[PDB]
Design a binder for this molecule. Structure first.
Ligand SMILES: CC(=O)NCCCC[C@H](N)C(=O)O
Length: 108
């Protein structure tokens, strides 16, 4: 059961990371790219951090994994204009994400 979740989550995270719209979210947002970001966004999240958390056995439920990935998207949509490339990527990758969640049969 626990390594069952672990495997599923690792597979899903890896596919999200490989996706072509994942590039904005691969590492923590850099100050040099976004100077006042950490002044606007209280709970930053990215896919590198999510990989470490996964390896650190933090994702003991569906809901913890979903909340971190959802945070990636909602940060991006709070910070960035609606027609920005960053916003478009967020919605594209979110659709991909949900398709892989259904495909896995992942429930709480
Ligand atoms: C994933 C994410 O939201 N990245 C931030 C992109 C920053 C865009 C631009 N340079 C800015 O400072 O608003």
């Amino acid at each position: 059961d626990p390594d069952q979740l672990y495997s599923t989550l690792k597979s899903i995270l890896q596919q999200v990371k490989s996706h072509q719209s994942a590039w904005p979210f691969m590492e923590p947002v850099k100050r040099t790219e976004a100077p006042g970001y950490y002044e606007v966004i209280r709970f930053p999240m990215d896919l590198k951090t999510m990989s470490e958390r996964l390896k650190n056995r933090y994702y003991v439920s569906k809901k913890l994994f979903m909340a971190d990935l959802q945070r990636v998207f909602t940060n991006c949509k709070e910070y960035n204009p609606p027609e920005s490339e960053y916003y478009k990527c967020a919605n594209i990758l979110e659709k991909f994400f949900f398709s892989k969640i259904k495909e896995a049969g992942l429930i709480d």
